[PDB]
């Protein structure tokens, strides 16, 4: 009951698992059963990250890298110093993200809201699971996963991308990039329009939604509306995440080779060649 | 002691405890499978 | 003791139990398939 209106909303119920067992708050944070699971998994994952780092060549936070086992090890559980730490941290991260989704669902139920936020975050959880669980399983080795390091997973991204020639020629990658760019443009437009509506110039009063409609019809000839903009932004962000997961999952499992050669299909269409 | 049930409900505590026991048992079994001394499937 | 069914819905309990059993059985079967000793399909 910190916020001036918070107290009346802090009621029992809305939990999926646990009921009244963990139905309480700790400061601003609601816990629930999935909050307990999130706390355990996330704290264990962080502690194991730092335990594996202490066994590594450096404690520099830039250069800390918890690496997966070698490809020759296949899909077996490796020794902790030889990639097992990475596997345990991956399991902890999966559990933590799933528990975060379920805690968001419980909090949505407590406030009389639908499950839009848990589903939206579950899209990103699916992207991560595709990156570090599904793709290594399909490829046959845990060594295909990206390392747990701030700058070494960028090295993983670079090397995996260049293993296919130029990763820019992946068409699902093109679609995901288009969704990302359109999302950022849409977010700029939506934030700017709302702020300009509530922060007028020239000493005028706060505007109505008719003013936003008029502004975007004078600008580009069309206005999507107040509900439509949030629908479109959610669609764009979720599509960006989902198509990122799809684009990475098919490279190395379904498509092997240079993505540049794929576009030789276009030149062979009998309509123009 | 029995008074622990005055602050925690048996129905929810049983579910939470069994979930934790399941995860712990799976972790221990997988750890055993990763060692050559105790792996019981790869070799005879 | 049938007291359990007074505090746990039989339908939800059965669904959860069967989901868990399915996941466990699939995991064990896949693990057995992964090993050369117990794989029953690759070799005669």
């Amino acid at each position: 009951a910190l916020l001036s209106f918070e107290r009346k909303y802090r009621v029992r119920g809305g939990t999926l698992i646990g009921g009244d067992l963990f139905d309480f708050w700790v400061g601003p944070f609601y816990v629930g059963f999935f909050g307990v699971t999130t706390a355990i998994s996330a704290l264990l994952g962080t502690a194991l990250i730092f335990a594996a780092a202490a066994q590594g060549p450096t404690l520099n936070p830039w250069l800390i890298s918890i690496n997966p086992p070698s490809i020759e090890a296949g899909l077996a559980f490796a020794p902790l110093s030889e990639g097992g730490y990475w596997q345990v941290i991956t399991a902890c991260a999966v559990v933590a993200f799933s528990s975060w989704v379920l805690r968001q669902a419980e909090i949505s139920r407590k406030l009389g809201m639908s499950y839009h936020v848990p589903i939206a975050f579950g899209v990103a959880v699916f992207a991560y699971v595709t990156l570090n669980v599904i793709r290594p399983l399909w490829m046959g080795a845990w060594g295909n996963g990206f390392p747990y390091g701030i700058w070494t997973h960028l090295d993983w991204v670079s090397n995996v991308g260049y293993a296919f020639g130029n990763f820019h020629y992946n068409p699902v990658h093109m679609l995901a990039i288009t969704f990302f760019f359109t999302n950022c443009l849409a977010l700029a437009l939506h934030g700017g329009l709302v702020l300009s509506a509530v922060n007028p110039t020239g000493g005028t009063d706060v505007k109505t939604p008719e003013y936003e409609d008029t502004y975007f019809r004078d600008f580009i000839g069309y206005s999507v509306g107040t509900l439509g903009i949030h629908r479109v932004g959610l669609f764009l962000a979720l599509n960006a995440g989902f198509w990122s997961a799809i684009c990475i999952v098919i490279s190395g499992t379904l498509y092997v080779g240079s993505w540049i050669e794929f576009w030789d299909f276009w030149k062979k269409i009998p309509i123009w060649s | 002691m029995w008074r622990i049930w005055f602050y925690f409900d048996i129905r929810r505590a049983l579910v939470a405890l069994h979930v934790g026991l399941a995860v712990l048992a799976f972790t221990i079994h997988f750890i055993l499978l990763s060692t050559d001394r105790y792996n019981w499937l790869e070799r005879a | 003791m049938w007291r359990i069914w007074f505090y746990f819905d039989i339908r939800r309990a059965l669904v959860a139990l069967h989901v868990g059993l399915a996941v466990l059985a699939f995991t064990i079967h896949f693990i057995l398939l992964s090993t050369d000793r117990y794989n029953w399909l690759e070799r005669a």
């Binding site: 086992p69 020759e72 090890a73 899909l75 077996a76 030889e82 | 499937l41 790869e42 | 992964s34 090993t35």
Partner: peptide, 20 residues
């Protein structure tokens, strides 16, 4: 995770595949 050990997988990749 598979039912094998990492050492067994590495030995199989080296000897049974990369050595013969």
């Amino acid at each position: 995770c598979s039912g094998n050990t990492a050492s067994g997988n590495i030995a199989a990749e080296q000897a049974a595949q990369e050595a013969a």
